[PDB]
Structure formats: C-alpha cells, structure tokens
C-alpha cells in the first residue's frame with residue numbers, strides 16, 4: 032500500500048484550501064521514481080465548480096482522503112502485475128485542483144477557490160528530495176486523462192526545477208496516457224454542456240493557468256489554450272515523452288458529440304478520427320496507440336493484456352528504457368495500429 036503524506040507547506044492547497052498531498056511507497060533498493068498524476072475532467076467557473084464540489088468533492092478537497100491506497104497497474108509492486116517497474120519508488124498524486132494541473136492561484140478575498148495544480152507538482156518534488164529522491168537516476172512523471180495532459184504541461188518544469196535546485200544528474204522523463212486530444216470538427220454541434228476549446232480558454236483565465244514557455248512564445252497571449260492539445264505542445268518539449276492513446280478514445284468521442292446501427296455519415300466520421308490521430312503520432316518515436324474504443328487507463332490491473340503488432344505496453348516501455356541508455360532488434364518503441372475500426376485489434380479491452 033501507498034501511505035498518505037499531506038504537504039508540509041500548507042499554503043499549497045486543493046480547491047477548498049485544504050492541504051494537497053501525495054501517497055508514497057518507498058523501495059530502498061531502487062534509484063527509479065514514478066510520480067503519477069490522477070485525472071478527472073476540470074471546472075471552469077463558479078457555478079460549474081460549485082456543482083463539482085457537491086458530487087465530486089474528493090477531486091476538490093483532502094478532508095475525506097483515506098490514510099492509504101493500493102498501487103495497481105504501473106503502480107503495482109508485484110512483478111506479475113507490473114513487468115515494467117515493479118521495484119520502483121511509487122508516488123500517486125491526487126488530483127484536487129480541477130485545472131488540468133495548470134493552475135497557480137490561491138484562494139483569496141477575490142477567489143472562492145484555489146487552483147494550484149502546477150504548484151502542487153513542484154511542492155511534491157521538493158518534499159520528496161528529503162525522502163530519497165535526491166538519490167534518483169530517473170524520475171518518470173506519468174499520468175492518465177487530465178493527468179496525461181498534465182504530464183505534457185509540467186515535465187519540462189520539473190526538469191528545470193531539479194537543475195536549479197542542484198540535481199542535474201536526475202533524468203526527467205514523461206509518460207502521457209489518454210491525454211492526447213484533437214481540436215477537431217464535431218459530429219454534431221451547438222452553458223457547460225453546449226466546446227472544449229472555449230471551456231479551456233475560460234478555464235485558463237479563471238485558474239491563472241500556466242503552459243510551457245516555448246509553447247507560450249509560439250502561440251502568444253490569449254492563445255495559450257493551444258498548448259493543452261498534445262500534437263501542438265509535444266514538439267516544444269525537451270524531456271523524452273512516451274505517448275499512450277487509444278485511436279478511438281471515449282472522452283474524445285463524447286466531446287465530439289458521438290454516442291454509440293452506424294450509418295454512412297457516422298462511419299466516415301469515426302474512420303477519419305482514427306486516421307487523424309494516427310497522423311499526429313507519425314513523428315512521435317515512443318508511442319502506443321491501439322485501435323480500440325476505450326476509456327481504460329494504465330493503472331488498471333490488466334494493463335498488460337493489450338498488444339500492438341504483438342508487443343505489450345510494459346514491453347514497449349522497457350524498450351524505451353533501453354533506447355535511453357539506432358533501433359533495437361525485436362524491441363520496438365513506436366507502435367501505432369493501422370486497421371481502421373474499433374476492435375479491429377483482437378487484444379482490445381473487453
């Protein structure tokens with residue numbers, strides 16, 4: 032089990048001003064550290080955040096968090112469940128800032144909520160350095176869904192923080208799961224429920240959201256929403272990043288207004304979505320993109336079962352490690368399906 036630690040700097044807070052925190056399991060015979068960012072949508076105005084506080088409060092507050100959590104999937108310490116990194120030091124960082132891990136604003140006389148996702152990551156890293164992270168050789172920043180986009184927004188900031196603090200030997204890398212979205216034309220179009228790009232644009236202003244500096248300089252003021260889309264922010268990053276994304280991701284289809292007898296118009300829409308996603312990954316050398324309709328993530332216990340071209344995700348991640356010690360015989364790292372319909376890969380989740 033991973034044990035809860037609330038942040039010693041209690042000014043770094045969840046939405047309601049309670050302290051943020053992290054869950055930790057140490058592995059004293061290991062110099063590898065895995066820091067995982069939880070997901071769970073976001074909120075972008077007072078009324079929408081007030082609703083989230085009533086029925087999704089664990090994503091806005093630490094008041095009700097449990098003392099322990101069990102590590103699963105890539106966070107498991109059992110080699111049978113986690114062939115990749117079972118002996119690593121494991122860290123799970125709860126998502127309680129509702130800002131896609133981008134915020135840097137405190138609760139004040141003008142702000143009903145605090146949005147501190149970017150500062151939470153920095154404070155966790157700072158406090159772990161006194162608990163053994165100072166001895167690491169690799170820090171893998173991973174995350175799923177909103178946490179996967181959070182990896183893209185924050186991995187280079189962690190690298191810069193460790194360099195400025197005096198630890199240039201720690202190699203910082205990223206693993207972004209299910210956070211690589213397209214700002215595409217929707218299948219049907221039209222408050223909250225009526226487009227993601229406009230909700231993110233309003234969110235950034237509400238949260239005082241921050242994006243990586245090279246991407247910010249490309250798109251400039253007012254246009255920072257572009258950096259929340261993987262295919263636009265990825266080329267600006269310097270740390271190595273491995274991208275995991277279903278070709279027919281369920282969250283992508285939901286915001287495209289698709290809810291699964293499929294007739295011709297919808298058939299062509301779904302096929303075009305898969306081809307566009309595959310196209311965005313052509314110049315991403317470390318990636319895993321199966322032709323499945325799914326919302327499942329890499330902290331699930333059966334994450335080892337899916338394969339692309341006969342290679343599982345734990346294997347591809349192992350080959351990525353070897354590559355960062357020119358392709359490797361029988362040890363591939365770029366794995367993108369080419370078949371054009373959900374479940375054309377027989378290994379897709381049931």
Ligand SMILES: CC(=O)NCCc1c[nH]c2ccc(F)cc12
Nearest residue numbers: 072177180212227259282283286
């Ligand atoms: C599903 C969707 O709306 N995707 C387009 C907006 C977007 C970009 N990165 C995200 C991370 C989490 C999230 F909830 C949304 C986003």
Ligand SMILES: CC(=O)NCCc1c[nH]c2ccc(F)cc12
Nearest residue numbers: 213214215216217226227228286
């Ligand atoms: C997932 C998501 O937010 N897609 C919508 C992006 C969008 C906003 N305005 C548009 C106008 C034309 C177009 F092709 C796309 C757009």
Ligand SMILES: *[C@@H]1O[C@H](CO)[C@@H](O)[C@H](O)[C@H]1NC(C)=O
Nearest residue numbers: 039040041042043150153154
């Ligand atoms: C706590 O964190 C905030 C936000 O990063 C920082 O400004 C402040 O200096 C920190 N306090 C201490 C005592 O380290």
